[PDB]
């Protein structure tokens, strides 16, 4: 039915125009619901046609907004699910020393069942990540964060009921989103503090631990985080302080820092330099990058829903999550 | 009440007098993309559900471009309607015709077909409706203004205005232009009822976006000598109330003349009209795709950049454009299907589709339209505009402000 | 010192507002905050801090030039009819910080134009001089694109003035009744006085809460007589 | 003059530093004709509190001009020498100025030099001659340590700037702006990258000054400095003070910038005058710093302020740092009127003066 | 230096004992006698506890010419841990602890005492085979030091050479 088409067009337009779901969990849920819907009301018989249809639609959605990789992750996850279910019904160096044109009957029902299982796991990821707060936080500890992330907020406020610590929050210069996080934390009695990015290194001598949130995790264990996290990681590495990253599994993309320049999302310079300056706006060149790149060497641990792990094992999670043929999409 | 708008795809004023002879004002490529495309994208993004497109001058081209465009597809949420007529001579006639046809029902937007903006009007429209529901038929129009500096390049003198508004509740008490005038006059009627929150505003950019009401069209039928919007506002202010809405975190501007054209072009390339940028490809076209790189350098497909040339600042290369060796291009917008020579300096130059520039040419602050061509050892000065299908001989040095067109009396000839 | 006190009384200044002398309220505004010296210009019949009283055998400007050899530093002109609950620091901070040449105090037919921050004095004019409309120059708007207009405010007739301004009053004997000739001229000059400066600026202070009522009629006289008691309850 | 009361709740780590508010000034509880405090000092303190004069050298110049005015307006009392009278009379003025806003290293060095010079005046010389000599010493000091030193540092830095370079500056420093303007006027063709930070946003001053000079400039905020450094070729920074251990005390966003620059392999330079060379030592910005008004952290984002009422939450703290310290291991070169010296030669110059 | 600031400030002091001669116990006791909230620990847990430390203040036996020290055994590891965590290491030493010599020598730098403190004499016959060494002092390079607090004010190690030129004569270096 054309209702699926109307929904797909609305989703692509809302992603390309402005931001859609505010939380990453809602974004992943909306993407998975749209994928399940595309699978449910559509004419497909064999796995190759369904996979190509999903690939074209996912390619469109990714071209709509390349920095929104949570949707590419969900598309690749659905593709991997389809491949696994098809291999279950149809039948490296160690390995080294395939058509999808057979049409079954119960393939759609089990694909939908797998998608629902993935949805429930997506829902439980938040508590699964927040449950590991006491294993890394201690009493009379100092924690530093940047920006506003729901995962880090839960991780911090889940341990305040049994531990007492001091939280330092560094705002983001273009979009001062750390103020909301600081207010939400102070509402729970955590003794929070707000500060600028210019005083990151100046205050990072009394800090004991750092917990932050990322937008996506690259293949070699590096991140695409908000602007200012590269400097935070540099200061942590200079003072040899562990930097924890609380990110669910859907924030993991199967790509290495191949690309160039289109990594960061550039928005209007109105936030950096207002339009009411004068005539100097014709000469002055202003750039406003929203995100930045954080190498893996400056990261210490990754707290996920399946337990903490080191960055040197993220490649295995990639091999476990996505299929090598669906990396380009 | 579904949001509906009216699009005037013809501006009954002729300032682009050479270029507007072969091709309308509203289809002039700004950043490889027409202005009516910008306006339709703004309307579709702000929440408009239906538009009424009125065209008089060269309407066939307008309609067959809209009919190829993505807004006329059955999958578009902003259904567009083309009403064509050869009698229209000014905006007042268009509004009179709207009143005669009874197309609009509720608060509708009045925008020109050459307005580029990313402003959201939900807030202003909400304010308008609440005000209208406290005063049922009072509060009839709302002009959107973008607060700026009087020094900004975007503020041209031909459109420059000064307002005397109320600061308690935004309400227009006096409105007048400042084109060729040094000391402003404000009558004493303004200080009549309250006399405490009155203020003069000179930091405003007229976006030419107005939230009108059907009663506006009613009054347009009433007053026969309302030829534009400005005259509607003056004649209502000599006497219903007209209000405003000022924006500070959004961009909006109307292309009225050439100087305004080079101001919005620079702003769009410098990402001041985000999300509307060349990298986004907001037209869903295949021949307008680009890639945004460092220093706001946009490169399309099949750019064929030669070894030695340096792209230093915010440039836009088209699809199929060919660049030579040892060139220097900066602040310049190049169209698709262009072909440059060698040792070519381009500084704030605008090349449309089908242009060829020979080797040894130095062009600065001048605009080349479709199918233009220049030979070797040619030097162009600032504001040295070439219209469609002109050819400039070799070893020629054009003066400043020169305009070349194939029609004899416009300004010059081949 | 920094400022000199002068209270002009050019009977009306001896009306018992609140069963106290009328000239006692300006002196009280001057007293309690330094001001060990005060200069009063009054009639011959008007007689009883450390008042320096001079007689007048005439406008405000003429009286100021009449006591020019007396003045040696920046002046603070006060009026005979002045009952106010304002802190003098509120206007002197404006005179001190921006090194302004003119600082005035007003409280909520005479049109005034103030900038965005609300204390820069940009335009000043009376209804009688303007022909039918209000004319505003382009330069003032190019520098300050926003001009907030007030009409209902009242003039308290108190100004923090410089010394060269008084020297200028001595030079040109054309300006009389500074409240209507000097202040507008200075406001029109910030955009000759330029000879004694060795740029001109004017500032304003608006309270919006107070008893800043200048007594000039019977109605204001009764209004002041009725409101003085809650203020005298705290003052004395 | 009473105490300058504090404003708001301070941070746990900076509980020993004063935190004031710009709306509540200390001149409220004083006589209009200032009797105990000099009028010049009152106006200077008001300007410092209101933020009218924001700069190391602008503050030092204003302080020295106010001191010249005070000496001109001050008459020595009988039965006492002037050499100690002036120092004892200037002590409360300095106390008041510190109460208005904590003094900087430049002001401290200037006050120390002035006290030394005043104490050096003999009891036999007359009053007018001594006052004139002090005023002349003040003017010659300004001329030698501020204007001529700036010209010598610009003359020395002109050789380091080359054509095609990409220089990155931070904040607002008159010395860096003068250096760049003189290099651009001398024929060098480069482009500058201006980095700014909240809430002062003072980098726009240098940005507009360079645009008025004709230098191609760029503007961006400090969190994105790691994005622009790969294309940057040089990093010019201003310093408010240089401690005896070589560490650089400057605006808060300098140490982090120097750290990121070293990670991107970009040589960092520091420009400072010899009169800003402090003899004390500090290893970090926690034990001694300055906390400005916390209400500057409030920002109008969207349609509501997230920190509109921060004092209601007794657990919420607002930290607004001003200065910071950089270790000598992140500074490559130091430019002074004596010549280009490394950072581990700061005490040697302190030796010669 | 520590007990002079406890009357106006409150801090937590960690004391690492010395394995051969456990002299840190006396210091910890003397500090706790003044109410400074002191703690005692072994050298094996230096790096393990040096993640929550904010500053280090130590004493040396002599200062070499290039700004290096001859301190008690265990200070080299402390300086290494400080440099790994980028924590300032302060050295409080008067002017008489400054010697005009560079690390020229070899092996006779450290003072070796009887192995009785490391391994007792009552072990058995293994003392004939096992070779035991007990160095009292060690060498700390200047690169791991941050500041030197002396009677004439703090200074950096990169200026200690000047203090040498100021204190001693170049002809009296060999003595």
Author numbering:
A (entry chain D): 8 to 98, 108 to 113, 120 to 351
B (entry chain A): 41 to 279, 285 to 459
C (entry chain I): 1 to 10, 24 to 61, 71 to 79, 84 to 134, 155 to 237, 262 to 268, 297 to 334
D (entry chain E): 167 to 519
E (entry chain C): 177 to 351
Sentences copied from the publication:
Crucially, for every round of cap-dependent translation initiation, eIF2 requires GDP-to-GTP exchange, catalyzed by its dedicated guanine nucleotide exchange factor (GEF), eIF2B. Molecularly, eIF2B is a large, heterodecameric complex composed of two copies each of an α, β, γ, δ, and ε subunit. The decameric holoenzyme is built from two eIF2Bβγδε tetramers and one eIF2Bα2 dimer. However, we and others recently discovered that binding of the inhibitor eIF2-P to a distinct binding site — located on the face of the eIF2B complex opposite of the substrate-binding site — allosterically switches eIF2B from its active ‘A-State’ (which can readily engage eIF2 and catalyze nucleotide exchange) to an inhibited ‘I-State’.
Here, we show that a single engineered H to D mutation in eIF2Bβ alters the conformation of the eIF2B decamer, resulting in altered dissociation kinetics of substrate eIF2, a ~ three fold reduction of intrinsic enzymatic activity, and resistance to ISRIB rescue. After 2D and 3D classification, we generated a single consensus structure of the βH160D decamer at 2.8 Å resolution with most side chains clearly resolved. In the WT decamer, βH160 forms a π–π stacking interaction with δ’F452, which is lost in the βH160D eIF2B decamer and leads to the retraction of the short loop bearing this residue. In the βH160D decamer, β’R228 repositions itself within the network of three negative charges (βE163, βD160, and δ’D450) and one aromatic amino acid (δ’F452) to reach a new stable state locally. The loop movement caused by the mutation propagates across the entire tetramer, resulting in the rocking motion observed in Figure 4B. Comparing the βH160D decamer to A-State (eIF2-bound eIF2B) and I-State (eIF2α-P-bound eIF2B) structures, we noticed that its ISRIB binding pocket was 3.3 Å wider in its long dimension than that of the A-State, again reminiscent of the I-State. The widening of the binding pocket can explain why ISRIB fails to assemble βH160D tetramers into octamers or affect GEF activity. An overlay of the βH160D decamer structure with the eIF2B-eIF2 complex structure revealed that the substrate eIF2α binding pocket was widened by 2.9 Å. As established before, a similar pocket widening is observed in the I-State structure of eIF2B (2.6 Å induced by eIF2α-P binding). This widening is predicted to prevent eIF2 from properly engaging the fourth binding site on eIF2Bδ’ and hence turns the decameric eIF2B into conjoined tetramers such that only three of the four eIF2-eIF2B binding interfaces remain readily accessible to eIF2 binding. The βH160D decamer rather represents a continuous distribution of conformations with a more restricted range of motion compared to the WT decamer, and for which the average converges to an I-State like model.
